[PDB]
Amino acid sequence: MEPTRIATNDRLSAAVCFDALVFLSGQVPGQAEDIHGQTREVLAKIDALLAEAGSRKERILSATIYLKDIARDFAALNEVWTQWLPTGQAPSRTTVQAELARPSVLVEITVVAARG
Amino acid sequence: MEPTRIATNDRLSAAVCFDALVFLSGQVPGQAEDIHGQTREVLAKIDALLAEAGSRKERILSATIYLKDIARDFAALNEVWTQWLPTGQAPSRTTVQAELARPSVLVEITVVAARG
Amino acid sequence: MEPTRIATNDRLSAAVCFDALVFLSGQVPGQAEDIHGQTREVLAKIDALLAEAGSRKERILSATIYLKDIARDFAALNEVWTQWLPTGQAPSRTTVQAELARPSVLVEITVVAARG
């Protein structure tokens, strides 16, 4: 059994599958500048990668949520996050403050999920 | 095979099990204000979640330890951590500095463990 | 099935294996003081731990890359990283800013990999 990959470049693959596990690269926003829009864009990108890798939102196992300013943006993050999640099926989660690769990025989320 | 969950709310589940793996949400302290007490409270909460999920301390696979002030609190963290761990059975570990969701939180720990 | 461990001390094991998974402790540099040298030293240590644990670079599933100064060092990190990776086989990746246990440490990397 060897890992399979989705959207591979010289630095990373957007997803790596092995056994029944899906490992996603941390996903960053599109063009939104605000925390609400950026969180929507991150979660939408995760949604698509899960689909490509044979998983789905109900089968997320863990998410690390990185916020550039956790005090300022935690409430907005939770608002978009809880609406995005399938009811009653929230994953394990860790939310911490960290600067991301670009200063305009307010939120980045790293997901591990189950294939199925 | 579908994931099972423990202590699910609208934002997260305290634990998600899949296959023989246990994914715990990052655990934060109780009411302690000092690094020693907070680390004890975090590890005790992890201890209970492992028990609920069919694991135990000897079967931890990985721990990310987030410290609000790694320079100040690293030694105290290690003191409580090494005493809490079963002898000779320490897991893989990563210790980094990050602000947590509340400024009074000095330590948060995210564990993945093996069911058994 | 119980976890097995490599290079266990009172705080951590350099590697923990379970099922077909390898969990590595975050690896820190040797004596280099510059970002290029430190990244080389980190990746070399990861390379050896994978070998000891029955894995290899082509079977990395995920890497969290912590940089002390992501704005300053991201380009240098990517330069060493992309050269170190086997062609076409990059893993899932997340790169964030975090202070490490010593102020002289500029980079720390935490890998999960597949045994095989």
Residues from chain B that touch C3, judged by Cβ atoms under 8 A, are 59, 61, 114
Query: Please, are residues C10 and B89 in contact by the beta-carbon 8 Å criterion?
Result: no
Mutate to test the interface with B, among C18, C52, C69 (most CBs of B within 10 A): C18
When CB atoms are compared, the residue of A2, A15, A25 closest to C94 is: A25
DSSP-derived 3-state class of residue B37: helix
Which residues in C have their CB inside 8 Å of a CB on A?
Answer: 19-20, 59-62, 64, 70-71, 74, 78, 81-82, 85, 88-98, 112, 114, 116
Neighbours of chain C (3+ CB pairs under 8 A): A, B
The CATH T-level fold of domain B4-114 is: 60s Ribosomal Protein L30; Chain: A; (3.30.1330)
Are the Cβ atoms of B3 and A59 closer than 8 angstroms?
A: yes
Nearest to B96 by CA among C53, C74, A87, C70: C70
Of C1, C11, C25, the CB nearest to B78: C11
The answer to whether C26 touches C66, Cβ cutoff 8 Å, is yes
Question: Using a CB-CB distance cutoff of 8 angstroms, which residues of chain B are in contact with residue C103?
Answer: 71
C78: nearest Cα among C67, C88, C89, C68: C67
The β-bridge relationship of strands C13-18 and C60-67 is unpaired
Q: Residues A40, A31: contact at Cβ < 8 Å?
A: no
B5 is known to lie in a ligand binding site: no
**Residues of A in Cβ contact (< 8 Å) with C89:** 5, 8
Q: According to the 3-state scheme, what is the secondary structure of chain A? A: CCCEEEEECCCCEEEEEECCEEEECCECCCCCCCHHHHHHHHHHHHHHHHHHCCCCHHHEEEEEEEECCHHHHHHHHHHHHHHHCCCCCCCEEEEEECCCCCCCCCEEEEEEEECC
- Which site among B72, B96, B109 would you substitute to test the C interface, given the most C Cβ atoms closer than 10 Å to its Cβ? B96
* Pairing state between β B60-67 and B92-97: parallel
User: Do the chains contact at B26 and A89, CB–CB below 8 Å?
Assistant: no
Known binding positions of C for pyruvate: 93, 95
Q: How many CA atoms lie within 13 A of B43 on its CB side?
A: 19
Strands C92-97 and C60-67: parallel
Identify from A61, A68, A81 which residue to disrupt to test chain B contact, counting B C-beta atoms within 10 A and taking the largest count: A61
Residue C22 in contact with residue B91, Cβ under 8 Å? no
First-last CA distance in chain B:
17
Which strands sit side by side in the sheet containing B13-18, from one edge to the other?
B4-8, B13-18, B21-24, B107-114, B60-67, B92-97
Q: Are B23 and A61 in contact (CB under 8 A)?
A: yes
Residues of B in contact with C108 (CB under 8 A): 94, 96
